[PDB]
């Protein structure tokens, strides 16, 4: 089926957009010290899966990465624990700087796939 390409590439576009938004949010919150209720910011990631044989890619869910918080010592802070160690986001920088580029490249590649498929479908529309 050549119609399924549209909702395969749309799924790919949506998944890559979600991944790029997650990476941008992590980069923005790379240094945020607290949330709305004292909960430290946690790096988040998306889960990709196949639609199903094989099909498009769907984002199953968004999960906070389970890594120890890079806690720092600020005793004169209300959020400090009993030992004065406040918790900071466990977000690197190279990871997101590469995730953005990879997501953009995949997005552009799927755009090219959709363009080619649409062109050949329109060409087939005038058989004979």
């Amino acid at each position: 089926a050549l119609l399924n390409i549209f909702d395969i590439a749309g799924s790919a576009l949506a998944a890559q957009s979600k991944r790029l938004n997650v990476a941008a949010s992590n980069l923005a919150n790379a240094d945020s010290v607290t949330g709305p209720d004292g909960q430290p910011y946690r790096a988040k990631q998306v889960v990709f899966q196949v639609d199903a044989a094989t099909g498009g890619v769907k984002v199953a869910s968004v999960i906070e990465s389970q890594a120890p918080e890079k806690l720092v010592y600020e005793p004169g802070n209300p959020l400090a624990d009993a030992n004065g160690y406040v918790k900071m986001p466990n977000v690197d920088v190279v990871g997101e700087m590469v995730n953005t580029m990879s997501a953009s490249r995949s997005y552009q590649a799927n755009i090219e796939v959709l363009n080619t498929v649409k062109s050949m479908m329109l060409k087939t529309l005038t058989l004979g």
Binding site: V72, Y73, V93
Partner: protein
């Protein structure tokens, strides 16, 4: 990034040491003055993965 925070802590520790040294030197003429000495301590350790 963690490196900047760690180096900031190190610079603060050295500044405090210089402060106590300067205080010790300033009142070298005060009667009955007992010189101070600052002792530091390393913070906790984060284990990314166990052996």
């Amino acid at each position: 990034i963690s490196s900047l925070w760690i180096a900031k802590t190190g610079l603060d520790a050295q500044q405090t040491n210089m402060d106590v040294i300067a205080n010790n030197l300033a009142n070298v003429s005060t009667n009955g003055f007992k010189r101070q000495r600052a002792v530091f301590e390393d913070l906790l350790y984060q284990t990314i993965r166990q052996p």
